[PDB]
Symmetry: D2
Subunit: 256 residues, 4 copies
Amino acid sequence: EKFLVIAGPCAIESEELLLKVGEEIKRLSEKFKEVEFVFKSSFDKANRSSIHSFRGHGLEYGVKALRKVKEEFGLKITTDIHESWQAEPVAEVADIIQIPAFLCRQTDLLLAAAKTGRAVNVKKGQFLAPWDTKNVVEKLKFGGAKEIYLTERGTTFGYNNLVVDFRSLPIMKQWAKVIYDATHSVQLPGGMREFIFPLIRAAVAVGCDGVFMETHPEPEKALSDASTQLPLSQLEGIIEAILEIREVASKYYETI
Amino acid sequence: EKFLVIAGPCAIESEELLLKVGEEIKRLSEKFKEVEFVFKSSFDKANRSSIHSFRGHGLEYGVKALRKVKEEFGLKITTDIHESWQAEPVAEVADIIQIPAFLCRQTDLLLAAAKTGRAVNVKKGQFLAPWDTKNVVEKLKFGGAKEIYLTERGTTFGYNNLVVDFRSLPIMKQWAKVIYDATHSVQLPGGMREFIFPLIRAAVAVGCDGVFMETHPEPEKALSDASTQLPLSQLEGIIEAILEIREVASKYYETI
Amino acid sequence: EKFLVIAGPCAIESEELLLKVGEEIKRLSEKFKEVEFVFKSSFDKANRSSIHSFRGHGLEYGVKALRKVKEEFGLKITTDIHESWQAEPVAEVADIIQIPAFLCRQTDLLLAAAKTGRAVNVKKGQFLAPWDTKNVVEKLKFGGAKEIYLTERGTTFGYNNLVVDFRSLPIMKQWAKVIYDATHSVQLPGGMREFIFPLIRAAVAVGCDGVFMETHPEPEKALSDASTQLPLSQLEGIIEAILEIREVASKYYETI
Amino acid sequence: EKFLVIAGPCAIESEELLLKVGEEIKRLSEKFKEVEFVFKSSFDKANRSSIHSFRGHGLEYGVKALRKVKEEFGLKITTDIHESWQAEPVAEVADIIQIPAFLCRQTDLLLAAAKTGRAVNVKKGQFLAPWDTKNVVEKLKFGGAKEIYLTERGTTFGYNNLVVDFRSLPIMKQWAKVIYDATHSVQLPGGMREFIFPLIRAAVAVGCDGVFMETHPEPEKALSDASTQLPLSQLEGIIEAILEIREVASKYYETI
């Protein structure tokens, strides 16, 4: 099956930033034709820890910026919603509607996304067990979602730390396509970047249907996830690497 | 002020049920004058694991039933909101607006609640560290909130289990009044009841500003949290117990 | 039943240190006649993290020092063993043989202790679940132990942190007398002292058969657990406090 | 050196069993010349949960059976010790002395093993953080050990569950060769088998110096770890698989 690579700057810092990243993602989509790329960027960081942190420039601006990316590069789009009313407006540009990890149990949000007819990707909450996602998918199917993804992004392990239990990949594969979030899984809630590559190598060796990676031209200047966003120049190398590992491991992937 | 006791049926299964429970909470209210009682019940279980589970009769019916309780018994009220728009209409009856555990980091919900001018009680997310609640309080203060509470309801401990780290009480007290949720803290996410009383005794021995307890005339028939709701008949005994323990223990509560 | 208070300096830094602490413990035993005191001090810290840390002055010296304490004050004695051969020599002075947390599953060590005819106190391993102690007690009874204690000393919670799940007290009470280790439960393996008092208050409110506390005249100069050992001058106050809380909570202790 | 593969039946149920398994490990040994195979089996299960469980036939019988394997097949050997005195006699046959997970902090055991001059493999305790293993290595070096290995076998994740934090591999590699225990890592303390292969693939994709695997002709009849021992017939396929994945992935293994 065609491997999915969801990537883009964590937050829509500006339409300019988006075009710059999109340009590179477009180039890579031309090279890695066996990969389905989907450009991601949040129009709003609605769950920041601090009231003083960057959130975004609003829904309107963001959707317009995402529209430009899709229009200028012919790239599929994905962004996350935080309240039910945003599903409709966002569905006008997003090919995949993303559900935030903290909100993976909010029935109305999932239902709002499902009725748009768009694909839906749910980030597995840090409090959720792998088998607890079966009901999440049920809610979505009940709501009319026909293309569903579950994203592994780490589990609460003591305070201010997350651990990736790779057993979750084959478990969740029982009821949906599985995505591995390479950048959020190594973040320390409320020692990081050095683990992105090795853990993504593990994900494809175990077997998943795609990877999710935040990437920014200059991570140290990012207004969001400055410690975990992957430098844009490193994207190509990481993708080639996972495709290589995926291929050699592929014959051993177990059948659900 | 005085020790707070927030109690009531988990969900508004019918205003009839609320009246029955409200009568008992009213009685205890007259019996324990030193305690500030607050009637609680959710108009919507917006985060059930299953799509086929009981959610409720809607916000309107709920707010109406809650009004009835405040009118017939003169009891302060509290209920939880799940999306920003709900803050205003709910504030009409709710003396304290409750913020769900999974939603404790959703900035807009916190601000919407703070804007109503009402008191706000935030359930500490199972993914949050005690010190991480400082930023939660700051959001509410920035939003104009002046009466703020933080509720301990357990922390993710492996899969489908929560542990109560009592070190959280002293830590959270540095920036807000602390409430201990005696019924959700022993619930196993996605043997429980026997631990409610023991842990509520610990909470008072350690030191808190109030306790939160779900109570129902016949818990076995409850449409929500049937395994952990306290039988109405046992409420008085437990309240008297924690008041006696608090009386003796308070002498040793640490300053700030 | 008579409440147990196990206390003494963590390590046998010298026979002098032991006599100084014993003197105070003897004084308190005369005051709190409803408490059974047992003087504790390790002749060897066999599990230190660093090869450069203090271990002790040997088995011979330690047993001789403990002998002096018992002889000079008429105090019961307890110390821990680390290998099977030490059970016999130690049993000559120790009224209670203590089994280290990391070694709670070592069959021969438990059996070696049990055949001495002495009481045995097993520190619950940081990796053990409360219900997993039923087999520990079975091994001891199988080995002839007639007086068995299980000590709660915290559970692994993420890296370099321990959490106390107070549900363990009533669970373990099903098959043995339960002791709460007030000082080791707040230590950070491999922010501490301020939680000793509140957590011990929780322990007695929930209900246990005794408490274990490391105490040293000048904790900052201790060669072991310098961050968690309770100042000797604070011992009396803590004991009076727990006896008070125990008494008022006692009528609510559940029957196993 | 070359990639290490430590395999064999969990316990020495009979030297007959060891010979059968030894023959297959011998065959694979001739098939994969680039791999250094080491036969492993315990002469004593000194930490079983139940007093009524299989422990073994003793140290003498065990050491003898192990000799037979090394003599008949010319295979290097490894077995674990549980008390200091056992180091010397075991070193007679064991090329690598294994230190149990629960005993990874017992200084005397580590020193006794280091003194034999043999290589030492320490199973990382389920309670230890990855960086906490630095001190473990230092103990062994101080004891004269020169060939040191650290084995990842899971970390306590809530009750009766272990999680493999693959970040540990890169961290531990800073001070020792790293081995991944593919069978104990998925065992539930006090659904398992299906995760052995997936996680071993991750270990090699991430990067390690060897893998540890319990194997038995008929796991369902094993007297120990019956639920997780790998069927002998599947050993070859899994070894070939990890060698292919390693071949491709090694290109991206991080330096130091």
